[PDB]
Design a protein around this nucleic acid. Structure first.
Ligand SMILES: NC(=[NH2+])NCCC[C@H](N)C(=O)O
Ligand SMILES: [Mg+2]
Ligand SMILES: [Mg+2]
Ligand SMILES: [Mg+2]
Ligand SMILES: [Mg+2]
Ligand SMILES: [Mg+2]
Ligand SMILES: [Mg+2]
Ligand SMILES: [Mg+2]
Ligand SMILES: [Mg+2]
Ligand SMILES: [Mg+2]
Ligand SMILES: [Mg+2]
Ligand SMILES: [Mg+2]
Ligand SMILES: [Mg+2]
Ligand SMILES: [Mg+2]
Ligand SMILES: [Mg+2]
Ligand SMILES: [Mg+2]
Ligand SMILES: [Mg+2]
Ligand SMILES: [Mg+2]
Ligand SMILES: [Mg+2]
Ligand SMILES: [Mg+2]
Ligand SMILES: [Mg+2]
Ligand SMILES: [Mg+2]
Ligand SMILES: [Mg+2]
Ligand SMILES: [Mg+2]
Ligand SMILES: [Mg+2]
Ligand SMILES: [Mg+2]
Ligand SMILES: [Mg+2]
Ligand SMILES: [Mg+2]
Ligand SMILES: [Mg+2]
Ligand SMILES: [Mg+2]
Ligand SMILES: [Mg+2]
Ligand SMILES: [Mg+2]
Ligand SMILES: [Mg+2]
Ligand SMILES: [Mg+2]
Ligand SMILES: [Mg+2]
Ligand SMILES: [Mg+2]
Ligand SMILES: [Mg+2]
Ligand SMILES: [Mg+2]
Ligand SMILES: [Mg+2]
Ligand SMILES: [Mg+2]
Ligand SMILES: [Mg+2]
Ligand SMILES: [Mg+2]
Ligand SMILES: [Mg+2]
Ligand SMILES: [Mg+2]
Ligand SMILES: [Mg+2]
Ligand SMILES: [Mg+2]
Ligand SMILES: [Mg+2]
Ligand SMILES: [Mg+2]
Ligand SMILES: [Mg+2]
Ligand SMILES: [Mg+2]
Ligand SMILES: [Mg+2]
Ligand SMILES: [Mg+2]
Ligand SMILES: [Mg+2]
Ligand SMILES: [Mg+2]
Ligand SMILES: [Mg+2]
Ligand SMILES: [Mg+2]
Ligand SMILES: [Mg+2]
Ligand SMILES: [Mg+2]
Ligand SMILES: [Mg+2]
Ligand SMILES: [Mg+2]
Ligand SMILES: [Mg+2]
Ligand SMILES: [Mg+2]
Ligand SMILES: [Mg+2]
Ligand SMILES: [Mg+2]
Ligand SMILES: [Mg+2]
Ligand SMILES: [Mg+2]
Ligand SMILES: [Mg+2]
Ligand SMILES: [Mg+2]
Ligand SMILES: [Mg+2]
Ligand SMILES: [Mg+2]
Ligand SMILES: [Mg+2]
Ligand SMILES: [Mg+2]
Ligand SMILES: [Mg+2]
Ligand SMILES: [Mg+2]
Ligand SMILES: [Mg+2]
Ligand SMILES: [Mg+2]
Ligand SMILES: [Mg+2]
Ligand SMILES: [Mg+2]
Ligand SMILES: [Mg+2]
Ligand SMILES: [Mg+2]
Ligand SMILES: [Mg+2]
Ligand SMILES: [Mg+2]
Ligand SMILES: [Mg+2]
Ligand SMILES: [Mg+2]
Ligand SMILES: [Mg+2]
Ligand SMILES: [Mg+2]
Ligand SMILES: [Mg+2]
Ligand SMILES: [Mg+2]
Ligand SMILES: [Mg+2]
Ligand SMILES: [Mg+2]
Ligand SMILES: [Mg+2]
Ligand SMILES: [Mg+2]
Ligand SMILES: [Mg+2]
Ligand SMILES: [Mg+2]
Ligand SMILES: [Mg+2]
Ligand SMILES: [Mg+2]
Ligand SMILES: [Mg+2]
Ligand SMILES: [Mg+2]
Ligand SMILES: [Mg+2]
Ligand SMILES: [Mg+2]
Ligand SMILES: [Mg+2]
Ligand SMILES: [Mg+2]
Ligand SMILES: [Mg+2]
Ligand SMILES: [Mg+2]
Ligand SMILES: [Mg+2]
Ligand SMILES: [Mg+2]
Ligand SMILES: [Mg+2]
Ligand SMILES: [Mg+2]
Ligand SMILES: [Mg+2]
Ligand SMILES: [Mg+2]
Ligand SMILES: [Mg+2]
Ligand SMILES: [Mg+2]
Ligand SMILES: [Mg+2]
Ligand SMILES: [Mg+2]
Ligand SMILES: [Mg+2]
Ligand SMILES: [Mg+2]
Ligand SMILES: [Mg+2]
Ligand SMILES: [Mg+2]
Ligand SMILES: [Mg+2]
Ligand SMILES: [Mg+2]
Ligand SMILES: [Mg+2]
Ligand SMILES: [Mg+2]
Ligand SMILES: [Mg+2]
Ligand SMILES: [Mg+2]
Ligand SMILES: [Mg+2]
Ligand SMILES: [Mg+2]
Ligand SMILES: [Mg+2]
Ligand SMILES: [Mg+2]
Ligand SMILES: [Mg+2]
Ligand SMILES: [Mg+2]
Ligand SMILES: [Mg+2]
Ligand SMILES: [Mg+2]
Ligand SMILES: [Mg+2]
Ligand SMILES: [Mg+2]
Ligand SMILES: [Mg+2]
Ligand SMILES: [Mg+2]
Ligand SMILES: [Mg+2]
Ligand SMILES: [Mg+2]
Ligand SMILES: [Mg+2]
Ligand SMILES: [Mg+2]
Ligand SMILES: [Mg+2]
Ligand SMILES: [Mg+2]
Ligand SMILES: [Mg+2]
Ligand SMILES: [Mg+2]
Ligand SMILES: [Mg+2]
Ligand SMILES: [Mg+2]
Ligand SMILES: [Mg+2]
Ligand SMILES: [Mg+2]
Ligand SMILES: [Mg+2]
Ligand SMILES: [Mg+2]
Ligand SMILES: [Mg+2]
Ligand SMILES: [Mg+2]
Ligand SMILES: [Mg+2]
Ligand SMILES: [Mg+2]
Ligand SMILES: [Mg+2]
Ligand SMILES: [Mg+2]
Ligand SMILES: [Mg+2]
Ligand SMILES: [Mg+2]
Ligand SMILES: [Mg+2]
Ligand SMILES: [Mg+2]
Ligand SMILES: [Mg+2]
Ligand SMILES: [Mg+2]
Ligand SMILES: [Mg+2]
Ligand SMILES: [Mg+2]
Ligand SMILES: [Mg+2]
Ligand SMILES: [Mg+2]
Ligand SMILES: [Mg+2]
Ligand SMILES: [Mg+2]
Ligand SMILES: [Mg+2]
Ligand SMILES: [Mg+2]
Ligand SMILES: [Mg+2]
Ligand SMILES: [Mg+2]
Ligand SMILES: [Mg+2]
Ligand SMILES: [Mg+2]
Ligand SMILES: [Mg+2]
Ligand SMILES: [Mg+2]
Ligand SMILES: [Mg+2]
Ligand SMILES: [Mg+2]
Ligand SMILES: [Mg+2]
Ligand SMILES: [Mg+2]
Ligand SMILES: [Mg+2]
Ligand SMILES: [Mg+2]
Ligand SMILES: [Mg+2]
Ligand SMILES: [Mg+2]
Ligand SMILES: [Mg+2]
Ligand SMILES: [Mg+2]
Ligand SMILES: [Mg+2]
Ligand SMILES: [Mg+2]
Ligand SMILES: [Mg+2]
Ligand SMILES: [Mg+2]
Ligand SMILES: [Mg+2]
Ligand SMILES: [Mg+2]
Ligand SMILES: [Mg+2]
Ligand SMILES: [Mg+2]
Ligand SMILES: [Mg+2]
Ligand SMILES: [Mg+2]
Ligand SMILES: [Mg+2]
Ligand SMILES: [Mg+2]
Ligand SMILES: [Mg+2]
Ligand SMILES: [Mg+2]
Ligand SMILES: [Mg+2]
Ligand SMILES: [Mg+2]
Ligand SMILES: [Mg+2]
Ligand SMILES: [Mg+2]
Ligand SMILES: [Mg+2]
Ligand SMILES: [Mg+2]
Ligand SMILES: [Mg+2]
Ligand SMILES: [Mg+2]
Ligand SMILES: [Mg+2]
Ligand SMILES: [Mg+2]
Ligand SMILES: [Mg+2]
Ligand SMILES: [Mg+2]
Ligand SMILES: [Mg+2]
Ligand SMILES: [Mg+2]
Ligand SMILES: [Mg+2]
Ligand SMILES: [Mg+2]
Ligand SMILES: [Mg+2]
Ligand SMILES: [Mg+2]
Ligand SMILES: [Mg+2]
Ligand SMILES: [Mg+2]
Ligand SMILES: [Mg+2]
Ligand SMILES: [Mg+2]
Ligand SMILES: [Mg+2]
Ligand SMILES: [Mg+2]
Ligand SMILES: [Mg+2]
Ligand SMILES: [Mg+2]
Ligand SMILES: [Mg+2]
Ligand SMILES: [Mg+2]
Ligand SMILES: [Mg+2]
Ligand SMILES: [Mg+2]
Ligand SMILES: [Mg+2]
Ligand SMILES: [Mg+2]
Ligand SMILES: [Mg+2]
Ligand SMILES: [Mg+2]
Ligand SMILES: [Mg+2]
Ligand SMILES: [Mg+2]
Ligand SMILES: [Mg+2]
Lengths: 116, 202, 149, 64
RNA sequence: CGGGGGGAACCUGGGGAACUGAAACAUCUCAGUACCCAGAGGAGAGGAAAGAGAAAUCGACUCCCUGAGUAGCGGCGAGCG
RNA sequence: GCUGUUGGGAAGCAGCGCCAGAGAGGGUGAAAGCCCCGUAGGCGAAAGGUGGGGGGAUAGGUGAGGGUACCCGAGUACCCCGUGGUUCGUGGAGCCAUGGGGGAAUCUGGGCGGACCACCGCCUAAGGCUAAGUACUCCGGGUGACCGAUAGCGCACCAGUACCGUGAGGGAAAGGUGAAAAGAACCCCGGGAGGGGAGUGAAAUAGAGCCUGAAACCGUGGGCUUACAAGCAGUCACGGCCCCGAGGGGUUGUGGCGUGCCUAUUGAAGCAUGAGCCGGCGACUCACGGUCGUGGGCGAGCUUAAGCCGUUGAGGCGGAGGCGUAGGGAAACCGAGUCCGAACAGGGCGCAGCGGCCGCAAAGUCCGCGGCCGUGGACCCGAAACCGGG
RNA sequence: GGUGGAGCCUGGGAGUGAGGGCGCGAGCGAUAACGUCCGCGUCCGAGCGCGGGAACAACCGAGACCGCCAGCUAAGGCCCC
RNA sequence: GGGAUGACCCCAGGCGGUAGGGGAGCGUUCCCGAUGCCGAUGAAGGCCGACCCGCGAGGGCGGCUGGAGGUAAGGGAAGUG
RNA sequence: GGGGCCUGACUGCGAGGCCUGCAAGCCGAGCAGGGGCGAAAGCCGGGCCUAGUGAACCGGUGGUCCCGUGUGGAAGGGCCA
């Protein structure tokens, strides 16, 4: 019994083109070029979702060092105090106290200058 | 071994026979797939790259034409050309072991015997070659039509009466086979057809 | 039982190995066949049972023994198949080449020769040759050997 | 079509009862004058072939 | 009275290669296959033992199974059978 | 087999019935055992053809001892020389056939049984004929776990055609409206083509350039966005606008990161190969044999092959034979042993189920399935060349 | 001592038989070569996935099942990018 | 380890990867299942989907087109991506 | 290095091992047969050692007396060297 391609090939090419919607030129209109693109973005994502956690921390850190320096010290000198002080609040939160609740943070700064 | 319900004018007497106790699903399976294989036609065919009806001239030179390399346009890489490993006539039939069938021919029945779906009869009272002469019978035998049936007798007239019936499989007991048994929900026989049966699994 | 009920026992109808159908199968592209080489090529290698790459083969380098025959060919001389005593326990009474054939012990065309690896039975045995050991056991066990011509 | 018994083997070798390949010993066809008596003596006997090579020389004997 | 020519393959006779295989190649193989020619027919050939070959046996020929990839053949190589 | 019902159409769903030696299938406005063509089961030939079976003719057929020693297939048998066939490639080389030379006999003859001689046996050449069982498939029919318009024959259609070639020869593409043409009267813009209403239809982006109508490709309208930017074009975070009704979709301004796919490579984004794009064809199979594994059946036993009967998707018969039950040896030959050997020596290849009679397991064997191997085009396409006949 | 995708044995299926950089020991080379030929090892090959090295298969770090807007570290780094 | 057996639960450890070995599955054509079930209140196919289940290949659901075919659990065979 | 008598420069095997991809190549105690040198214990299966060589196929010579193509022989072979 014969069994030609039939309905199978097309459909799969419509899987790849639906995920390729929004791509420039053929990349969204040509199948082959849609795969070659979906390949990269496939690795770019997981290569980048692994990075989001590093793009922020560095940010967060960048904001804390700014505040810390408003009180007469630097990000380096108060990470230690919070260590020595036994404080485990994280840079994400620390980065939000530094902006919205600037007088809580000031405390932490103080509890850091002393823990040393 | 098993008590068989026999349907006589005197009344449902019972009979016993030493049908197998264990049912091997695999064996019953292998019989069928034999039955269902050796009855295949084997008439699928494709026309190889030499059987096609073109010439053989190298369509254009091997080099310097600027296009691919080709020979005869009967190559399966062409359209309308040869077919690679497509079918040909074949003898799907094959030689299943006898005991494997003489055994699956007793396992088959016995199964229906466990269910009580097996029924025997001395004769068929008043059938003489007219279907309607049968349902009146089958009615009185509890054969309402709600169950597919395998009628297994030598009496021609009988087999001729019910063979057109959407829920009855007819067979000379000389042709009783598993697949037809399993095909069905019940199973009926003459003590005759019952007798030869015995004399085939023996 | 019912057609839908009829499975084969697990493992008695294994799938197949389709090579050349994608990266996922682990069999795509080179079709489990390697990269280049006479072995990947179609048709492939000369009989690996013998050929060795040009050097004189292991088998051609071995010496030939004994008579290899000549034309017209095989010589016809009576042929003997030996059956052991223990294989004769099943019978009662009188054993002959025939019965031992229809039993499945002696092939046709061959003659009957009794062996002794077993224990005799006080049986009338008819054959074309016994062994020294077989006789002693056969005459000792109250048997009646009977040679043929 | 069915396989053909390779005669180049059936004339040199012989399959035992356990599945081994036994071929005569190579060396004493000619050039034997200065050979030992031990060397002529030992070479007049069969030797079990290496497992890999024997396995091959049995696939050539499909009917023995 | 008969013949002449045609017929898809199938059949018998007269002739008859090569690539290829032998991991080169000449004997060898491919193979008396492909092909050409004459002929015949619904079939053609073969066929009533100056046979087979060891049974003191068989009983024309044809075909299939089996005998058997046995006996044997072979730069005893590939392979043939 | 009518009705009722939804519907453009009933064969659909509902109610009540019927046939069935016919519930194979195909049609009918859709899905019909009972509407049409058919199916099971039966009928049928004035005339041509055939007539392998029946009956009838005819040519043709037939005894025994006794003596006789006329006949019993000629350039033949037979010998040598040169070849062909047979499994036989000069081999120890017979047998069958015959181109060259020499060249008999008629049963007390002659050929044969693998050079030759003898014994013993088989046959009776040099004239011819001979049914069926066997092979093929232009033709007709039945049937398919065969194809379904790049498939299936090269042709589903006006195909060995158009077209290519001086010629042999090469060799396509091309199917489908609808249940029914009821195939769009008439009017309007236009030379026409084409369209716009009217009208038909269940449906007219089913309008004949017609079933379904995908993708590349082209265009019109809309939302977001872009003229100080840089780039395998994407991914992550955020923000602005648009849509849908703590959320999601489309879009992209900025910041971060980022060297196509495949191929061949020690190593490619790679200035190494292949590919403009899309859609369809397109490459590890089959038969026999072998060898491991596996699910089963039987088990010192297992199994049949061609065939015969049965069936018309019914299976059963068939034991010839093959593998196994014993191996060792070049062999005679011995044999649980055997071979080298003087050996009672030494060595090679060999030799011996589990519980309580039973059951269970197994050597082995058989069919299935799977991987791999041998033989064939054997995973697909590709040479330059050889050969044969035209 | 060691219970590890350790080892022994029998059997089926392969691929590989074109390696390359680095480090140390040599030969050859000119105490040349991104040179060549061997030895122990390592890595790339197959980790062209990640961090460092401005950028770079093989130098330093480190063996990526998947997800997080959590924490600690290695090489390397902390004036600005 | 539970419990008894692939019922699901807990603890621990493994899971970069070319050639290549192995295992478990999806999907296409076809056959039994089928004189059956689905279908004009609309089959197969086609365009959308931001919803559902699946690691994924894929499977359902809904809306538009489409206008007569399709085919389940469980198995079989391939011109199967 | 000298000399005396000698032929073990044995036949039939050969446990166990070195080496090793195959096949080969290498060492070899000891048992019997029959001998040699020695008072004896003991040594001797050529050479202080490591190269001085060539697998199968085909055929020659001596021996064996295994097969002998209806049987007894022969042709021609196989085994030993
Ligand atoms: N009488 C019989 N043996 N009938 C067997 C079945 C015959 C046929 N196949 C049918 O179905 O009608
Ligand atoms: Mg395809
Ligand atoms: Mg498709
Ligand atoms: Mg595809
Ligand atoms: Mg798909
Ligand atoms: Mg993807
Ligand atoms: Mg990353
Ligand atoms: Mg991190
Ligand atoms: Mg940032
Ligand atoms: Mg400061
Ligand atoms: Mg901390
Ligand atoms: Mg604020
Ligand atoms: Mg087929
Ligand atoms: Mg052709
Ligand atoms: Mg052709
Ligand atoms: Mg043609
Ligand atoms: Mg051209
Ligand atoms: Mg060609
Ligand atoms: Mg063309
Ligand atoms: Mg062709
Ligand atoms: Mg074709
Ligand atoms: Mg065509
Ligand atoms: Mg074409
Ligand atoms: Mg094809
Ligand atoms: Mg092919
Ligand atoms: Mg056939
Ligand atoms: Mg098969
Ligand atoms: Mg068959
Ligand atoms: Mg049914
Ligand atoms: Mg019926
Ligand atoms: Mg299969
Ligand atoms: Mg297969
Ligand atoms: Mg792989
Ligand atoms: Mg695999
Ligand atoms: Mg390949
Ligand atoms: Mg492979
Ligand atoms: Mg392979
Ligand atoms: Mg390749
Ligand atoms: Mg290669
Ligand atoms: Mg290779
Ligand atoms: Mg090829
Ligand atoms: Mg080749
Ligand atoms: Mg022989
Ligand atoms: Mg033998
Ligand atoms: Mg030798
Ligand atoms: Mg010799
Ligand atoms: Mg020497
Ligand atoms: Mg010596
Ligand atoms: Mg000797
Ligand atoms: Mg045999
Ligand atoms: Mg045997
Ligand atoms: Mg004619
Ligand atoms: Mg001829
Ligand atoms: Mg010629
Ligand atoms: Mg040639
Ligand atoms: Mg060829
Ligand atoms: Mg070959
Ligand atoms: Mg060939
Ligand atoms: Mg050649
Ligand atoms: Mg070659
Ligand atoms: Mg050449
Ligand atoms: Mg030939
Ligand atoms: Mg001819
Ligand atoms: Mg003529
Ligand atoms: Mg003619
Ligand atoms: Mg005929
Ligand atoms: Mg004739
Ligand atoms: Mg005559
Ligand atoms: Mg045989
Ligand atoms: Mg055989
Ligand atoms: Mg040879
Ligand atoms: Mg030939
Ligand atoms: Mg109405
Ligand atoms: Mg009605
Ligand atoms: Mg019907
Ligand atoms: Mg019918
Ligand atoms: Mg119909
Ligand atoms: Mg239908
Ligand atoms: Mg109907
Ligand atoms: Mg009829
Ligand atoms: Mg009639
Ligand atoms: Mg007469
Ligand atoms: Mg007379
Ligand atoms: Mg006379
Ligand atoms: Mg010849
Ligand atoms: Mg000669
Ligand atoms: Mg000759
Ligand atoms: Mg002969
Ligand atoms: Mg002559
Ligand atoms: Mg005479
Ligand atoms: Mg005479
Ligand atoms: Mg003659
Ligand atoms: Mg003569
Ligand atoms: Mg003669
Ligand atoms: Mg004769
Ligand atoms: Mg003779
Ligand atoms: Mg005579
Ligand atoms: Mg004769
Ligand atoms: Mg005559
Ligand atoms: Mg004639
Ligand atoms: Mg005739
Ligand atoms: Mg005939
Ligand atoms: Mg026909
Ligand atoms: Mg169709
Ligand atoms: Mg189809
Ligand atoms: Mg078409
Ligand atoms: Mg066509
Ligand atoms: Mg179409
Ligand atoms: Mg021309
Ligand atoms: Mg013309
Ligand atoms: Mg041409
Ligand atoms: Mg036309
Ligand atoms: Mg129509
Ligand atoms: Mg007008
Ligand atoms: Mg006008
Ligand atoms: Mg006008
Ligand atoms: Mg008009
Ligand atoms: Mg109009
Ligand atoms: Mg209307
Ligand atoms: Mg409607
Ligand atoms: Mg509609
Ligand atoms: Mg439309
Ligand atoms: Mg329409
Ligand atoms: Mg239609
Ligand atoms: Mg259209
Ligand atoms: Mg259109
Ligand atoms: Mg626009
Ligand atoms: Mg500027
Ligand atoms: Mg701007
Ligand atoms: Mg951010
Ligand atoms: Mg809400
Ligand atoms: Mg940057
Ligand atoms: Mg960006
Ligand atoms: Mg990178
Ligand atoms: Mg790079
Ligand atoms: Mg390249
Ligand atoms: Mg290169
Ligand atoms: Mg680039
Ligand atoms: Mg470029
Ligand atoms: Mg290249
Ligand atoms: Mg490429
Ligand atoms: Mg182009
Ligand atoms: Mg495509
Ligand atoms: Mg393929
Ligand atoms: Mg394969
Ligand atoms: Mg095929
Ligand atoms: Mg096969
Ligand atoms: Mg196999
Ligand atoms: Mg069985
Ligand atoms: Mg049997
Ligand atoms: Mg021994
Ligand atoms: Mg032993
Ligand atoms: Mg058992
Ligand atoms: Mg098997
Ligand atoms: Mg293999
Ligand atoms: Mg072939
Ligand atoms: Mg192939
Ligand atoms: Mg091909
Ligand atoms: Mg080609
Ligand atoms: Mg070619
Ligand atoms: Mg030439
Ligand atoms: Mg030439
Ligand atoms: Mg373990
Ligand atoms: Mg490992
Ligand atoms: Mg390992
Ligand atoms: Mg292995
Ligand atoms: Mg090499
Ligand atoms: Mg290299
Ligand atoms: Mg290579
Ligand atoms: Mg190399
Ligand atoms: Mg190297
Ligand atoms: Mg290098
Ligand atoms: Mg570098
Ligand atoms: Mg280095
Ligand atoms: Mg250093
Ligand atoms: Mg150094
Ligand atoms: Mg160095
Ligand atoms: Mg050196
Ligand atoms: Mg250097
Ligand atoms: Mg180099
Ligand atoms: Mg090198
Ligand atoms: Mg590589
Ligand atoms: Mg690394
Ligand atoms: Mg590594
Ligand atoms: Mg790296
Ligand atoms: Mg990379
Ligand atoms: Mg890259
Ligand atoms: Mg890196
Ligand atoms: Mg970097
Ligand atoms: Mg950097
Ligand atoms: Mg590690
Ligand atoms: Mg820290
Ligand atoms: Mg820096
Ligand atoms: Mg900067
Ligand atoms: Mg992994
Ligand atoms: Mg890991
Ligand atoms: Mg690993
Ligand atoms: Mg691989
Ligand atoms: Mg596994
Ligand atoms: Mg698998
Ligand atoms: Mg499946
Ligand atoms: Mg598919
Ligand atoms: Mg049906
Ligand atoms: Mg249907
Ligand atoms: Mg309607
Ligand atoms: Mg609708
Ligand atoms: Mg379909
Ligand atoms: Mg479907
Ligand atoms: Mg739909
Ligand atoms: Mg229909
Ligand atoms: Mg189905
Ligand atoms: Mg299913
Ligand atoms: Mg089934
Ligand atoms: Mg195909
Ligand atoms: Mg294919
Ligand atoms: Mg001295
Ligand atoms: Mg001296
Ligand atoms: Mg003396
Ligand atoms: Mg040894
Ligand atoms: Mg060795
Ligand atoms: Mg030597
Ligand atoms: Mg002694
Ligand atoms: Mg002595
Ligand atoms: Mg003395
Ligand atoms: Mg010694
Ligand atoms: Mg020396
Ligand atoms: Mg000396
Ligand atoms: Mg040499
Ligand atoms: Mg040679
Ligand atoms: Mg002897
Ligand atoms: Mg004789
Ligand atoms: Mg003799
Ligand atoms: Mg005499
Ligand atoms: Mg004489
Ligand atoms: Mg002689
Ligand atoms: Mg001789
Ligand atoms: Mg010798």
């Amino acid at each position: 019994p014969r069994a030609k391609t039939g309905v199978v090939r097309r459909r799969k090419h419509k899987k790849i083109l639906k995920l390729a919607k929004g791509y420039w030129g053929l990349r969204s209109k040509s199948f082959r070029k849609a795969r070659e693109t979906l390949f990269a973005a496939g690795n770019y994502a997981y290569a980048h979702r692994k990075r989001r956690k590093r793009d922020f921390r560095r940010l967060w850190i960048v904001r804390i060092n700014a505040a810390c320096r408003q009180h007469g010290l630097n990000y380096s000198t108060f990470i230690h105090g919070l260590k020595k002080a036994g404080i485990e609040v994280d840079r994400k939160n620390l980065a939000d106290l530094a902006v919205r609740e600037p007088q809580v943070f000031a405390e932490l700064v103080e509890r850091a200058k002393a823990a040393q | 071994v098993y008590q068989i319900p026999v349907l006589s004018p005197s009344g449902r007497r019972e009979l016993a026979a030493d049908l197998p106790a264990e049912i091997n699903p695999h064996l019953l399976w292998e019989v069928v797939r034999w039955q269902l294989a050796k009855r295949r036609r084997g008439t699928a065919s494709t026309k190889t790259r030499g059987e096609v009806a073109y010439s053989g001239r190298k369509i254009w030179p091997q080099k310097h034409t600027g296009r691919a390399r080709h020979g005869d346009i009967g190559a399966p890489i062409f359209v309308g050309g040869g077919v690679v490993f497509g079918p040909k006539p074949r003898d799907y039939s094959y030689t299943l072991p006898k005991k494997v069938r003489k055994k699956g021919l007793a396992m088959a029945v016995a199964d229906r015997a466990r269910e009580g779906k097996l029924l025997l009869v001395e004769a068929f009272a008043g059938v003489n070659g007219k279907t309607k002469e049968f349902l009146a019978w089958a009615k009185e035998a509890g054969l309402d039509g709600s169950e597919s049936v395998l009628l297994v007798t030598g009496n021609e007239l009988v087999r001729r009466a019910a063979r057109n019936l959407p829920w009855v499989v007819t067979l000379a007991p000389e042709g009783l086979n598993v697949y037809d048994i399993v095909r069905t929900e019940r199973l009926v026989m003459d003590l005759d057809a019952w007798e030869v049966f015995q004399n085939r699994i023996g | 039982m019912k057609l839908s009920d009829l499975r084969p026992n697990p493992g008695a109808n294994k799938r197949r190995k389709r090579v050349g159908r994608g990266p996922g199968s682990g069999h795509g592209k080179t079709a489990t066949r390697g990269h280049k080489g006479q072995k990947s090529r179609s048709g492939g290698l000369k009989d690996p049972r013998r050929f060795e790459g040009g050097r004189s083969t292991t088998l051609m380098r071995l010496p030939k023994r004994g008579m290899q025959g000549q034309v017209p060919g095989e010589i016809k001389r009576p042929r003997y198949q030996g059956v052991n005593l223990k294989d004769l326990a099943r019978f009662e009474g009188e054993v002959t080449p025939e019965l031992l054939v229809r039993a499945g012990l002696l092939k046709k065309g061959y003659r009957l020769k009794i062996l002794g690896e077993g224990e005799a039975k006080p049986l009338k045995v008819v054959a074309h040759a016994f062994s020294k050991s077989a006789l002693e056991k056969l005459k000792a066990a109250g048997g009646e050997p009977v040679l043929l011509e | 079509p069915k396989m053909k018994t390779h005669k180049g083997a059936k004339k040199r070798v012989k399959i035992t009862a356990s599945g081994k390949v036994v071929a005569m010993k190579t060396g004493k066809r000619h050039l034997n004058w200065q050979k030992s008596g031990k060397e002529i003596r030992q070479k007049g006997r069969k030797f079990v072939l290496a497992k890999p090579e024997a396995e091959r020389i049995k696939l050539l004997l499909p009917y023995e």
